């Protein structure tokens, strides 16, 4: 299975488009708040209130909300993306066909890695996140078969301006730069050794 | 156990048989019925299910199951008690 | 009962007390247990030799087998505990 | 215990008191034994300090219990009713109260040890089988 | 000063709920001593055999 | 590993670990209520094949 | 009162006969239980009986 | 022997 | 792979059946011995740094127990030249056979291994350890009930109940609690054993049914630590709403089935006089009940705060249904007006 | 399948009962 | 495999076959309990046969 | 066996009832079954009525049985607005607790074997526990559950072993024959422990002054449907059983009554005195309840026939009046959530008819003629006075303080100024008036025909 690791705003979408065309297996659709709802039975998104009770737009509009949404989204997304793995890796063990994931769990290290730096989330939120990380991820053994990628921070800032959504435009730069910095500094630095 | 005569693993002696069988609607027995019934119901409720109306099939399986085993178990019951009563009286003649 | 039997039995009692005083790395315990095994063996065989209760000549060896067998198992567990530490009961 | 059992009645208080002292000493050695077994004292001298503690305490309790009981028997000269032990029972706790240097534990020990002893005597009178 | 308070809210409750409820605190922390080192209770098996 | 891929709650089994950080955790009233609301949906009262 | 005594209840007689039969039955069980304990103590004491022998 | 249970003593050959 | 796992578990079944069949002693000691070798590996599935020393505990105690047992058999033979079960003919030997079996049941003060070992393994291997392993040693005690030295038996039989109590009030994570529950019920089984074995076997059946109910439920919810159990009220409310009941049946509140054991036991011992012992025993059984109740408070009766992440899990039904479960609940609860049927056990 | 087995346990039960009563009358 | 006698290869006698044989012939319907009374003498001689 | 089946039958009816209609179902049929229960009352002037081998209906049980059947609808009327926002399955689950409970009562009153009577006597413990613990308000209820529980069991368990013992030392455990085959047990020491073993559980379940501590702390916590039963009935059943087992004992009772007569004769004045100064009403009522039960328990122990007559009467009367005060207090607690009595203040000013019920209820609490409460009490004072001429000086003080605090709860939570800001009150629902009228009317009709309530003696 192949999970492209495009790391940007509007460039995130660009990464997905290249990946979808690239692989025969169905492309990851992002698997965000209603990603579970897609598989649930109705196959359809619910209200945000119970399906996730996080809402990303309410992250970007007021990051560092007194309500810990800044974290509540993070961890919720991680659980969903974990399920993503399960939705597709099982299919890998079934039909034996390749299948194309969009972003995958190893990539979720970094958003929190920066949010902690901008201070959007308190440290204990992090400690919870890495205990649950260690407890859950460790048993999943094989990773990879997937392509890392890069885009300039400023250039993504440029496409971000081009991008229609207001919330995306608001997003801060220094945060995103901290993302790309830690992301390249550690994520590829460890994972490539396994993918090799 | 260890009583003279008799053989080990047979569930029920031919020496029984002579005792009347429990009648079909002995209340104890029907209670085995409902016992199976409720078990059959919890079988639904645990596995979500729309309780009662669903799987009325299997529910019937359970009630027939436990009433069935309950029957023979009742036979061995009466056999055993009749047995101790018999041994007791024989012994009271044995040592007047 | 002739004194010799008493002596072997006592060797058993020591072969137990040694198992239970139980100290440091546990490999000593698998030893002490096997010693215990050996004392039971000998104490059995002397008896079967005594009364010429011939069929039971088969038992001691069979005893030995399983007993040795479990001890043979025991080392394996020790391996695992040795595997993460370099063994100690402590 | 069979030795202690042949009181008789309460005659010769010393003869009895020595036996009760013996029983108290025995139980003290047992409690000390498991205590050392399950609470590794560290530095063995402390361990014998511990066992000296418990042994002496339980022996004391047995002594004082025995002699107060027999004295009450030889004074009230009732002498067979269960209450005859109960004082000693109540006394015993106080002994335990002294070593612990606490009014609380001594107070509770008085009451419960008293009731236990009273039940024991009552049992000798009634042949209660326990086992 | 008495009846509502010390006689029935503070002693009459001390004498048998709080007693047992405390004694089980002590005993329960004593028996379940958290540790679990082998040499300990294993040696205890020894002496309990010697007594038995 | 294939057995683990199936029965996804298992892969989710540790994601609901009780650590009780104030932002994640929810008081019993809101949870009892919201889940009381989740059952209100047409496809959720029962296992999917039965509803 | 008469009409009630007709439609609902009954003379004492049924109560009385019922009480009779009850006392008889339960008495019989009582004596049987005691006798059974006798039989059991003896039979275990001696082994002479069919159903305690090892 | 008084310990535990009696040990009859003398030489082994006797049995 | 399952094909080997099943052979192990079947040879455990055989390794106990063998004890339940053979009359010759040597085949009994073989029965336990084969049982052991086949019991250790099944504790080592998944395999943890923790699980390893769990198995070390279990093996070490079972091995020394089997040793003392064989020694006491040999001494029995020395003083009567027999191999048939029957009465033993030398008290110094007999007390040791009682000790060896006392370890095999895990009765106190030999008990300390059981709460620990349970901690080290998954609830599958756990349940199997607390039920199937309790058969064989009892299977031999029923055969040597004839000559038991009742004093020695009732003392461990009581002390098992006190220790099975006090060590039960203290713990959080459920498995250790299940350990103290079982270690407490064994006191009730082995208590009445000198007096009347049929009551023992009755109580045994109830105990096994009960602990099957619990462990199937814990499996069904994958709860472990008490708090972990606390969340379950919102996800699949029924099963917490059913743990309540099965717990009460552990507690022996009288309408419930679990009362049937105690209330036959009290009968039997009372025929023997021995009136005081059951009173202390029954009083302490209360203390045993109390932590079932507190554990009930964590779970069904009251709602500990849910964690958010739970919500997605609501969409996903539990799978791999365990067929035998519902009946194991129901038999372990409602069966009380079916005591007399106990005489089927003669 | 299971329904048929269930009916079978019935008819077998009423069978063995029925004959059992007769054997009772005889003995 | 049970018992001192009970057919052994090449019909080799037990060392204490006789007292054992008598003692078992004494033991049947008496069963276990009364057996420890009435057959005591036989078992005694068998004991001295053993030790 | 005729009354008992339908009582089981409401359960299917409850579960299958339409989701918003269940209250009507349970209410209507519970009323009907009450009326069917009423036909039992006839009894006989000589022999105790009999039925199956396994049930019988002594005159002592019948009024109690009628009462117990009567309470279910009441608890429903009280409950059915207290809860509303609860999910349908949970509510439907909830009334099952109540009805299951009364089913155990109808079984445990008619007895007949004292082991059956026991196992039901203790079986009652579960549903009331569940109700106290899941639907009580505020935190303390959790702790309360435990006090309610162990105090029963710690009492009941020895009783259990004792029961088994007797059926071994004598023939059958059955009540009729043991009433006839009864033979004295006397002094020694084993027999004394037999005595306490056969008394302590019953003297726990109806609170005794040294042991009553759980009871207030139950009533503080339980949702009202739990309160009405826990007060009006379970105490009374403990009394019923203790009146039952006194067929044995004697002459030993003559020698063992004294300590408990001291805890009771003193505990009545004492608890009533504590009753004179509570912080909050819901407890005040509870201590009033203990303060009356002490009278029952001495009435049982002096064992004079007058004393049992008075025992029966007072048991029932106190049942109804106590339940009445509880619902009547819960109404305030719902209107203002104060709980503390001081906040209610001038409640009479703002609404009248409730003040009238306060009047009737408290008025019969103090017991004035010719309330069955009073006449129930006067007998036991008579027999007590026969038992000891001094005893009156104690009883009189009771009749003093039970006046005071009773009137007190009236004049403090009613007469006087309204609190200003408490706008919350909203002018009395029909169900409220309906409910308490349902308590109090039977209580007043009942005085016309005591002769059917005085019981067997």
The residue extents of the domains of chain C are 3-90
Which chains does chain A touch, 3 or more C-beta pairs < 8 A? Answer: F, I
Q: CA-to-CA distance for L166 and I262, rounded, in angstroms? A: 17
**Residue A100 pairs with which residues in a beta bridge?**
A2, A27
Q: What residue in B sits closest to K29 (Cα-Cα)? A: B4
The dihedral through the CA atoms of I14, I15, I21, I23 has a sign that is positive
Q: Counting every residue, how long is chain F? A: 51
Short-list B65, B17, B81, CA closest to J17: B17
CA distances from A117 to A106, A110, A114, A145, C5 (A): 19, 11, 5, 30, 78
CA distances from A162 to A62, A151, A159, A170, I74 (A): 22, 16, 5, 12, 91
Inter-helix orientation angle L4-16/L88-110, to 10°: 180
Q: Are I260 and I339 in contact (CB under 8 A)?
A: yes
Query: DSSP code of A148?
Result: B
Q: Counting every residue, how long is chain G? A: 54
Cβ partners under 8 Å of residue L183, min gap 6? none
Short-list L432, L64, L74, CA closest to L227: L74
CB contact under 8 A, B91 and G49: yes
Extended strands (E) in A65-153 = 100-101
Contacts 24+ apart (CB under 8 A), D28-31: D28/D54, D28/D55, D28/D56, D28/D57, D28/D58, D28/D59, D29/D54, D29/D55, D30/E51, D31/D58
Q: CA-to-CA distance for C37 and I53, rounded, in angstroms? A: 23
Q: Is D55 helix (H, G, I), strand (E, B) or coil?
A: helix
What phi-psi label fits residue I173: left (phi over 0), alpha (psi between -120 and 50 degrees) or beta?
Answer: beta
Inter-helix orientation angle E38-51/C3-21, to 10°: 150
Short-list L228, L229, L221, L231, CA closest to L137: L221
Structure tokens at A60: 């970007």
Contacts of J1 in chain B (CB under 8 A): none
Q: How many CB pairs under 8 A join D and I?
A: 15
Q: Is L338 helix (H, G, I), strand (E, B) or coil?
A: coil
What phi-psi label fits residue A44: left (phi over 0), alpha (psi between -120 and 50 degrees) or beta?
Answer: beta
Q: CA-to-CA distance for L411 and L420, rounded, in angstroms? A: 18
Q: CA-to-CA distance for B76 and B72, rounded, in angstroms? A: 6
Contacts of I64 in chain E (CB under 8 A): 45
- Pairing relation of β-strands L56-57 and I306-307? unpaired
Q: Is L280 helix (H, G, I), strand (E, B) or coil?
A: strand
A9 labelled as ligand-binding?
Answer: yes
What helix, strand, coil percent values describe chain L, rounded to 5? 75, 0, 25
CA distances from D7 to D66, D69, D130, L265 (A): 10, 11, 21, 44
Q: What residue in E sits closest to L271 (Cα-Cα)? A: E3
Cβ partners under 8 Å of residue A78, min gap 6? A105, A108, A129, A133
Q: Is D98 helix (H, G, I), strand (E, B) or coil?
A: helix
Structure tokens at D71: 């004295």
CA distances from I338 to I3, L260, L372 (A): 40, 40, 44
CB contact under 8 A, K35 and G47: yes
Phi (first) and psi of residue I264, to 5 degrees? -90, -35
Phi (first) and psi of residue I79, to 5 degrees? -105, 15
CA distances from L433 to L255, L324, L358, L424 (A): 49, 11, 12, 19
- Mutation choice for I interface testing from E22, E38, E44 by most I CBs within 10 A: E38
Question: Which residue do the tokens 């992090």 mark?
Answer: A126
CA distances from L37 to C49, G2, L8, L58 (A): 83, 21, 14, 14
Q: How far is CA E26 from the centre of its chain?
A: 3
- Pairing relation of β-strands A2-3 and A100-101? parallel
Q: Count of alpha carbons within 13 Å of I8, Cβ hemisphere only?
A: 17
Number of H helices, E strands in chain D: 5, 0
Q: Does G5 touch chain L (CB under 8 A)?
A: no
The dihedral through the CA atoms of I32, I35, I37, I39 has a sign that is negative
Q: CA-to-CA distance for I251 and L153, rounded, in angstroms? A: 11
Cβ partners under 8 Å of residue L301, min gap 6? L253, L257, L260, L261, L264
Structure tokens at D90: 């109540």
CA distances from B75 to B71, B80, C81, D120 (A): 7, 9, 56, 49
Q: CA-to-CA distance for L71 and K44, rounded, in angstroms? A: 75
Query: DSSP code of A62?
Result: S
Structure tokens at L451: 């002769």
Query: DSSP code of K12?
Result: P
Q: CA-to-CA distance for A99 and A24, rounded, in angstroms? A: 7
**Residue L363 pairs with which residues in a beta bridge?**
none
Structure tokens at L44: 């006989």
Short-list L280, L277, L273, L279, CA closest to L294: L273
Q: What is the DSSP string of L50-81?
A: E-STT-EE-TTTHHHHHHHHHHHHHHHHHHHH
Which chains does chain B touch, 3 or more C-beta pairs < 8 A? Answer: F, G, I, J, K
Q: Are A53 and I311 in contact (CB under 8 A)?
A: yes
CB contact under 8 A, C19 and I77: no
CATH class as words, domain C3-90: mainly alpha
Q: Is D38 helix (H, G, I), strand (E, B) or coil?
A: helix
Q: Are L299 and L257 in contact (CB under 8 A)?
A: no
Other C-beta atoms closer than 10 Å to the C-beta of L374 total: 19
* Alpha helix (H) residue ranges in G1-54: 2-7, 12-46
L34-68: string of b/e by CB count within 10 Å (b at 16+)?
beebeebeebeeeebbbbeeebbbbbbbbbbbbbb
A163 labelled as ligand-binding?
Answer: yes
- Pairing relation of β-strands I306-307 and F25-26? antiparallel
Extended strands (E) in chain C = none
**Residue I307 pairs with which residues in a beta bridge?**
F25
The dihedral through the CA atoms of I171, I176, I177, I181 has a sign that is negative
Q: How far is CA A123 from the centre of its chain?
A: 20
Structure tokens at D36: 């050392």
Q: Are I294 and I248 in contact (CB under 8 A)?
A: no
Structure tokens at G2: 């008469």
Q: CA-to-CA distance for L98 and L230, rounded, in angstroms? A: 11
Q: Is I84 helix (H, G, I), strand (E, B) or coil?
A: strand
- Pairing relation of β-strands F25-26 and L49-50? unpaired
Cβ partners under 8 Å of residue I242, min gap 6? B42, B46, I217, I329
Other C-beta atoms closer than 10 Å to the C-beta of B56 total: 11
Q: Is I143 helix (H, G, I), strand (E, B) or coil?
A: coil
Q: Does I275 touch chain L (CB under 8 A)?
A: yes
Short-list G33, I265, D56, CA closest to L174: G33
Q: What is the DSSP string of F1-51?
A: -HHHHSSTHHHHTTTT-----TTTEE-HHHHHHHHHHHTTSTTTSS-TTT-
Number of H helices, E strands in chain A: 11, 2
Structure tokens at L431: 């169900």
Contacts of G22 in chain L (CB under 8 A): 50, 53, 176
Cis peptide bond upstream of L305, omega within 30: no
**Residue F25 pairs with which residues in a beta bridge?**
I307
Q: CA-to-CA distance for L102 and L127, rounded, in angstroms? A: 10
Residue A2: which H helix or E strand, with range?
strand A2-3
- Mutation choice for C interface testing from E36, E46, E52 by most C CBs within 10 A: E46
Q: Are D90 and D110 in contact (CB under 8 A)?
A: yes
Q: Are K33 and G54 in contact (CB under 8 A)?
A: yes
Q: Is I12 helix (H, G, I), strand (E, B) or coil?
A: helix
D with L: touching (≥3 Cβ pairs within 8 Å): yes
Q: How far is CA L328 from the centre of its chain?
A: 16
Q: CA-to-CA distance for I250 and I214, rounded, in angstroms? A: 10
A10 labelled as ligand-binding?
Answer: yes
Q: CA-to-CA distance for J5 and L34, rounded, in angstroms? A: 46
Q: Counting every residue, how long is chain K? A: 51
Cis peptide bond upstream of I160, omega within 30: no
Q: Are I243 and I318 in contact (CB under 8 A)?
A: no
Q: What residue in I sits closest to L119 (Cα-Cα)? A: I254
């Amino acid at each position: 299975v192949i999970t492209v690791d495009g790391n940007i705003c509007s460039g995130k979408g660009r990464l997905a488009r290249e990946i979808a065309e690239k692989l025969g297996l169905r492309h990851f659709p992002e698997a965000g708040i209603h990603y579970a709802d897609s598989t649930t039975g109705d196959g359809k998104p619910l209200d945000v209130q119970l399906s996730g009770n996080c809402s990303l737009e309410k992250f970007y509009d007021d990051p560092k909300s007194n309500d810990g949404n800044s974290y509540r989204l993070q961890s919720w997304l991680y659980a969903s993306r974990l399920l993503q793995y399960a939705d597709a890796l099982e299919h890998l063990l079934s039909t034996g066909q390749g299948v194309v994931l969009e972003r995958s769990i190893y990539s979720d290290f970094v958003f929190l890695e920066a949010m902690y730096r901008q201070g959007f989330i308190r440290k204990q939120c992090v400690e919870h996140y890495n205990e649950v990380k260690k407890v859950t991820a460790c048993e999943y053994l094989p990773p990879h078969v997937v392509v890392y990628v890069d885009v300039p921070v400023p250039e993504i800032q440029s496409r971000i301006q081009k991008k229609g959504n207001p919330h995306e435009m608001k997003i801060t730069a220094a945060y995103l730069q901290d993302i790309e910095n830690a992301y390249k500094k550690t994520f590829l630095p460890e994972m490539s050794e396994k993918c090799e | 156990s260890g009583r003279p005569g008799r053989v080990p693993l047979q569930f029920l002696p031919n020496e029984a048989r002579s005792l009347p069988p429990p009648k079909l609607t002995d209340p104890r027995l029907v209670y085995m019925g409902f016992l199976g019934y409720c078990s059959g119901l919890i079988d639904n409720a645990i596995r979500r299910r729309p309780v009662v109306s669903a799987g009325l099939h299997r529910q019937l399986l359970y009630v027939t199951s436990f009433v069935f085993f309950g029957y023979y178990l009742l036979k061995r019951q009466d056999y055993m008690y009749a047995l101790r009563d018999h041994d007791m009286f024989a012994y009271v003649k044995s040592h007047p | 009962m002739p004194l010799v039997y008493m002596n072997i039995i006592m060797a058993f009692a020591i072969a137990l007390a040694g198992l239970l005083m139980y100290r440091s790395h546990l490999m000593s315990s698998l030893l002490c247990l096997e010693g215990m095994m050996l004392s039971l063996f000998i104490m059995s065989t002397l008896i079967i030799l005594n009364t010429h209760f011939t069929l039971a000549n088969m038992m001691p060896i069979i005893l030995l087998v399983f007993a040795a067998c479990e001890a043979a198992l025991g080392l394996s567990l020790l391996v695992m505990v040795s595997n993460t530490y370099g063994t100690d009961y402590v | 215990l069979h030795k202690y059992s042949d009181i008789p009645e309460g005659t010769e208080c010393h003869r009895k008191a020595y036996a009760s002292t013996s029983i108290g000493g025995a139980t003290g050695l047992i409690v000390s034994a498991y205590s050392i077994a399950l609470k590794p004292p560290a530095s063995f001298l402390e361990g014998v300090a511990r066992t000296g503690r418990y042994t002496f305490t339980s022996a004391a309790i047995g002594a004082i219990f025995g002699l107060t009981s027999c004295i009450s028997a030889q004074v009230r000269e009732k002498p067979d009713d269960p209450l005859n032990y109960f004082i000693g029972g109540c006394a015993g706790g106080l002994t335990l109260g002294a070593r612990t240097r606490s009014y609380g534990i001594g107070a509770a020990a008085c009451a419960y040890m008293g009731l236990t002893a009273a039940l024991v005597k009552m049992g000798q009178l009634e042949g209660w089988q326990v086992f | 000063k008495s009846a509502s308070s010390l006689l029935d809210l503070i002693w009459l409750e001390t004498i048998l709920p709080k007693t047992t409820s405390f004694i089980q605190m002590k005993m329960s922390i004593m028996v379940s001593n958290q540790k679990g080192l082998i040499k300990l209770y294993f040696l205890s098996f020894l002496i309990t055999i010697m007594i038995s | 590993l294939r057995m683990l891929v199936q029965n996804k709650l298992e892969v989710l089994n540790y994601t609901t670990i009780p650590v009780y950080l104030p932002e994640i955790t929810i008081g019993a009233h809101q949870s009892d209520r919201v889940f009381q609301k989740f059952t209100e949906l047409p496809g959720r009262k029962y296992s999917p094949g039965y509803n | 009162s008469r009409w009630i005594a007709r439609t609902f209840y009954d003379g004492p007689e049924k109560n009385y006969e019922k009480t009779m039969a009850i006392l008889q039955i339960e008495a019989e069980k009582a004596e049987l239980r005691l006798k059974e304990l006798e039989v059991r103590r003896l039979m275990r004491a001696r082994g002479d009986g069919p159903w305690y022998q090892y | 022997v008084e310990i535990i249970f009696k040990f009859n003593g003398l030489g082994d050959w006797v049995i | 792979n399952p094909i080997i796992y099943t052979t192990l578990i079947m040879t455990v079944m055989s390794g106990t059946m063998l004890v339940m069949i053979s009359s010759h002693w040597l085949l009994i000691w073989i029965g336990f011995e084969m049982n052991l070798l086949a019991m250790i590996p099944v504790l080592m599935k998944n395999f943890n740094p923790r699980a390893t020393e769990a198995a070390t505990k279990y093996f070490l105690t079972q091995a020394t127990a089997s040793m003392m047992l064989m020694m006491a058999i040999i001494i029995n033979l020395l003083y009567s030249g027999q191999w048939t079960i029957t009465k033993m003919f030398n008290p110094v030997a007999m007390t040791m056979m009682t000790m060896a079996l006392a370890m095999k049941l895990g009765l106190s003060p030999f008990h300390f291994w059981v709460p620990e070992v349970t901690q080290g393994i998954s609830l599958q291997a756990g349940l199997l350890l607390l039920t199937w392993q309790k058969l064989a040693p009892l299977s031999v005690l029923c055969q040597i009930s004839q000559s038991i030295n009742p004093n020695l038996m009732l003392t461990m039989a009581m002390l098992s109940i006190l220790i099975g109590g006090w060590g039960g009030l203290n713990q959080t994570q459920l498995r250790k609690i299940m350990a103290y529950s079982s270690i407490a019920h064994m006191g009730w089984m082995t208590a009445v054993l000198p007096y009347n074995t049929t009551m023992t076997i009755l109580n045994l059946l109830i105990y096994i049914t009960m602990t099957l109910a619990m462990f199937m439920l814990l499996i069904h919810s994958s709860a472990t630590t008490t708090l972990s159990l606390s969340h379950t009220w919102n996800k699949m409310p029924v099963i917490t709403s059913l743990m309540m009941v099965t717990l009460l049946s552990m507690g022996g509140l009288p309408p419930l089935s679990g009362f049937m054991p105690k209330w036959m036991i009290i009968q039997e011992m009372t025929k023997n006089e021995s009136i005081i012992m059951p009173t202390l025993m029954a009083m302490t059984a209360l203390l045993n009940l109390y932590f079932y109740m507190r554990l009930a408070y964590s779970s069904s009766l009251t709602m500990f705060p849910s964690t958010n992440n739970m919500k997605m899990k609501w969409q996903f039904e539990h799978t791999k249904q365990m067929k035998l479960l519902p009946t194991m609940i129901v038999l372990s609860t409602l069966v009380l007006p079916m005591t007399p049927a106990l005489s089927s056990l003669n | 399948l299971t329904l048929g087995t269930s009916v079978f346990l019935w008819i077998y039960l009423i069978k063995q009962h029925k004959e059992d009563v007769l054997e009772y009358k005889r003995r | 495999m049970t018992i001192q006698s009970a057919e052994q290869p090449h019909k080799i006698p037990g060392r204490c076959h006789a007292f054992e044989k008598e003692w078992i012939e004494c033991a049947h319907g008496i069963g276990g309990i009364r057996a420890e009374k009435e057959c005591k003498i036989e078992f005694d001689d068998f004991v001295e046969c053993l030790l | 066996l005729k009354i008992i089946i339908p009582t089981t039958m409401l359960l299917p009816m409850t579960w299958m009832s339409k989701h918003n209609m269940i209250w009507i179902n349970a209410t209507v049929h519970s009323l009907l079954i009450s009326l069917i229960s009423l036909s039992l009352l006839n009894q006989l002037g000589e022999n105790s009525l009999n039925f199956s081998l396994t049930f019988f209906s002594d005159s002592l049980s019948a009024p109690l049985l009628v009462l117990t059947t009567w309470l279910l609808p009441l608890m429903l009327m009280a409950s059915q607005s207290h809860l509303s926002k609860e999910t349908t399955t949970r509510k439907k689950l909830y009334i099952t607790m109540l009805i299951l409970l009364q089913l155990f009562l109808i079984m445990t009153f008619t007895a007949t074997e004292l082991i059956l009577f026991y196992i039901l006597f203790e079986a009652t413990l579960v549903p009331t526990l569940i109700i106290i613990t899941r639907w009580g308000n505020q935190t303390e209820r959790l702790n309360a559950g435990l006090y309610f529980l162990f105090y029963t069991l710690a009492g009941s368990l020895p009783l259990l072993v004792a029961l088994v013992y007797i059926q071994n030392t004598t023939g059958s455990l059955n009540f009729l024959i043991i009433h006839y085959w009864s033979h004295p047990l006397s002094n020694s020491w084993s027999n004394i422990f037999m005595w306490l073993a056969c008394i302590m559980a019953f003297m726990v379940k109806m609170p005794l002054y040294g042991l009553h501590l759980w009871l207030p702390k139950a009533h503080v916590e339980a949702p009202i449907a739990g309160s009405m039963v826990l007060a009006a009935v379970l105490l009374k059943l403990g009394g019923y059983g203790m009146m039952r087992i006194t067929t044995i004992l004697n002459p030993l009772t003559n020698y063992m009554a004294y300590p408990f007569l001291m805890l009771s004769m003193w505990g009545m004045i004492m608890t009533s005195s504590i009753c004179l100064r509570q912080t909050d009403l819901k407890s005040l009522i509870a201590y009033s309840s203990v303060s009356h039960m002490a009278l029952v328990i001495v009435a049982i122990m002096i064992q004079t026939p007058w004393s049992f007559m008075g025992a029966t009467a007072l048991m029932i009367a106190h049942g109804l009046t106590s339940s009445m005060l509880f619902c009547l207090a819960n109404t305030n607690y719902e209107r203002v959530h104060s709980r503390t009595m001081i906040l209610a203040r001038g409640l009479q000013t703002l609404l009248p008819l409730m003040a009238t019920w306060w009047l009737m209820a408290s008025l019969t609490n103090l017991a004035l003629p010719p309330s069955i409460n009073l006449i129930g009490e006067l007998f036991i004072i008579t027999a007590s006075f026969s038992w000891s001429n001094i005893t009156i000086i104690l009883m009189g003080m009771n009749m003093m303080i039970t006046a005071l605090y009773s009137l007190y709860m009236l004049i403090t939570t009613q007469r006087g100024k309204y609190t200003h800001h408490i706008n919350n009150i909203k002018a009395s629902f029909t169900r409220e008036n309906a409910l308490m009228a349902l308590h109090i009317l039977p209580l007043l009709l009942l005085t016309l025909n005591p002769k059917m309530i005085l019981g067997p003696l």
